[PDB]
């Protein structure tokens, strides 16, 4: 399958990504908190289930939550304040919280479960977010991150998450929380984010071009 596009509400952002976030790929974003990382996360939560000429992929969603992010209250503002029933956008995203580092692991397995029952209906998972992906990889390794198991397992969940991007034509979205933090360096996208003056919120490819600027509005995010 091509490429598929899916705006993240920002102009600006949307032209740094050279369209918007890609299907069949790892997209990671990662700042601090409040650096817009989740209000990303929410407002692409929305827009892939637009049709293409708005900037969407008429898809489903799937959220994997490591600390408790998800507002099903945003998604509706987002929503509401867009051309959307938020009815059947709260309907369209299936939620699930990893409640240690082994069960995330499993719930991936589980989402391809769910990926091939919706993949011949006419909403098919386009968009599979997990927040603050590498959580419980840190907190469950203090004092032994040494242990090849940690970046065994993390190695093995990204490869899966990268299997699933692939084989299903799917946009892989993850976010990362910032030194003991570790992050998705194996994404096929790495994008920074942070704070900046007035409010906005500034993003920067990794490339291991140019600053894309927006603001956390109503309709989530904007130029």
Do not use: C
Request: hydrophobic share 40%; proline share 2%; net charge neutral.
């Amino acid at each position: 399958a091509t490429i598929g596009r899916i705006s993240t509400g920002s102009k600006s952002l949307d032209k740094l990504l050279g369209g918007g976030i890609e299907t069949q790929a790892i997209t990671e974003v990662f700042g601090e908190f409040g650096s817009g990382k989740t209000q990303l996360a929410h407002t692409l939560a929305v827009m892939v289930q637009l049709p293409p000429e708005e900037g969407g992929l008429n898809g489903s969603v799937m959220w994997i939550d490591t600390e408790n992010t998800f507002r099903p209250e945003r998604i509706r503002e987002i929503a509401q304040n867009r051309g959307l029933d938020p009815d059947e956008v709260l309907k369209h995203i299936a939620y699930a919280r990893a409640f240690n580092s082994n069960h995330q692991m499993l719930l991936v397995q589980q989402a391809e479960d769910m990926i091939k029952e919706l993949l011949n209906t006419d909403r098919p998972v386009k968009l599979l977010i997990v927040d603050s992906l590498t959580s419980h990889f840190r907190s469950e390794y203090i004092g032994r991150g040494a242990l090849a198991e940690r970046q065994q397992k993390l190695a093995k969940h990204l490869a899966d998450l990268h299997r699933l991007a692939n084989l299903y034509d799917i946009a892989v979205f993850v976010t990362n929380q910032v030194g003991g933090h570790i992050l998705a360096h194996s994404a096929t996208l790495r994008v920074y984010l942070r704070k900046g003056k007035g409010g906005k919120r500034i993003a920067r490819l990794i490339d291991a071009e140019g600053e894309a600027v927006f603001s956390i509005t109503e309709k989530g995010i904007e130029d």
